[PDB]
Amino acid sequence: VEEIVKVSRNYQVTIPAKVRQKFQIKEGDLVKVTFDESEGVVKIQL
Amino acid sequence: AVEEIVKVSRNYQVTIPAKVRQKFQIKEGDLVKVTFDESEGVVKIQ
Amino acid sequence: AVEEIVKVSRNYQVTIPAKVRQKFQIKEGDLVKVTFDESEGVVKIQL
Amino acid sequence: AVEEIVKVSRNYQVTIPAKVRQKFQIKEGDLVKVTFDESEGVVKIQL
Amino acid sequence: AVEEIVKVSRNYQVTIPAKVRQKFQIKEGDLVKVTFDESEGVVKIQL
Amino acid sequence: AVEEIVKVSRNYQVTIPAKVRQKFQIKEGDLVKVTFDESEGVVKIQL
């Protein structure tokens, strides 16, 4: 479950609908955004 | 860790905050890949 | 040394950590030679 | 030698092939150490 | 600047790191010109 | 000039050739700074 997205103004990233089936975020929700040094990726967690 | 709390915007977007972008150097308009990692139960942005 | 403990993934796949890849620069589709070194008891990965 | 050619997988993973695994017995979930060997300029995987 | 520290490898080789290659796109097998700039006292690599 | 054409090696390595090394006296294990110089469009390698 992988999709390419374009980063929006003010560095916003859509979480695509196919990803959200597994990660069900809603307007208003708090998420933790982390840089993972081990893999060199950003992680988003609920 | 380099972590921040972000509130999910309208239309299911997540801002990548400045502190995170110091290590993950995306620019407005960039393409990125958004994946659900099942093992860890997080979204990865790569 | 630049190294990390990693958990093996499905289908016997091993993630090469980002700090290791700074020195050993691989991308999907690259050919590598994977060898078992008996003397050292390790697997070696070469480009 | 026990060697095989492997194509790097998505997300910077390398498959450990069956011929290599006859000598280096790993599977999904196992812990391994992945290192960059500076002297040889290769990646090594150790149990 | 786009700069990185590299340790000279065996046989007098220098890795061109990924951040530098975003600007200087070289591939294995490519011809490049290595020059000593006598006045600045540095090496320069050109395509 | 002291210049020579070389072929890029695996893992994006460049050999610093012998005629260059007579002037830029590097050795396995030395640290060097590798920079992309935009003005000149070259990679610089400095001790």
Author numbering:
A (entry chain F): 3 to 48
B (entry chain E): 2 to 47
C (entry chain B), D (entry chain A), E (entry chain C), F (entry chain D): 2 to 48
Task: Reproduce, without paraphrasing, sentences from the article in which this PDB structure was first reported.
Sso7c4 appears to be the first repressor-like protein described in crenarchaea and may play a regulatory role in gene transcription. The Sso7c4 protein possesses a homodimeric DNA-binding fold that forms a swapped β-loop-β ‘Yin-Yang’ topology, and it belongs to the SpoVT-AbrB superfamily. The dimeric Sso7c4 protein, which consists of eight intertwined β sheets and two flanking α helices, forms a dimer via intermolecular associations between β1 and β3′ (the primes indicate the second monomer in the dimer) and β1′ and β3 in the flank, β2 and β2′ at the top, and β4 and β4′ at the bottom. In our study, Sso7c4 exhibits DNA-binding activity and alters the trajectory of the DNA through bending and bridging.
We also determined the crystal structure of C-terminally truncated Sso7c4 at a resolution of 1.4 Å to address the potential effect of the flexible C-terminus on DNA binding. The crystal structures of the wild-type and C-terminally truncated proteins are similar, as indicated by the good superposition of their α carbons (the r.m.s.d. value is 0.35 Å for 85 atoms). In contrast, the C-terminally truncated protein bound to the 10-bp and 20-bp DNAs with similar affinities (~11 μM) but bound to the 8-bp DNA with slightly weaker affinity. At higher protein:DNA ratios (1:0.5 dimer:bp), a considerable number of C-terminally truncated Sso7c4-DNA complexes were observed to form a more open circular shape (67%, n = 109), suggesting that the C-terminally truncated proteins induced DNA stiffening. The FRET data confirm the EM observation showing that the C-terminally truncated protein forms a rigid filament along DNA. In conclusion, wild-type Sso7c4 induces the formation of a more compact DNA structure primarily through both bridging and bending interactions, whereas C-terminally truncated proteins rigidify and open the DNA molecules at high protein concentrations.
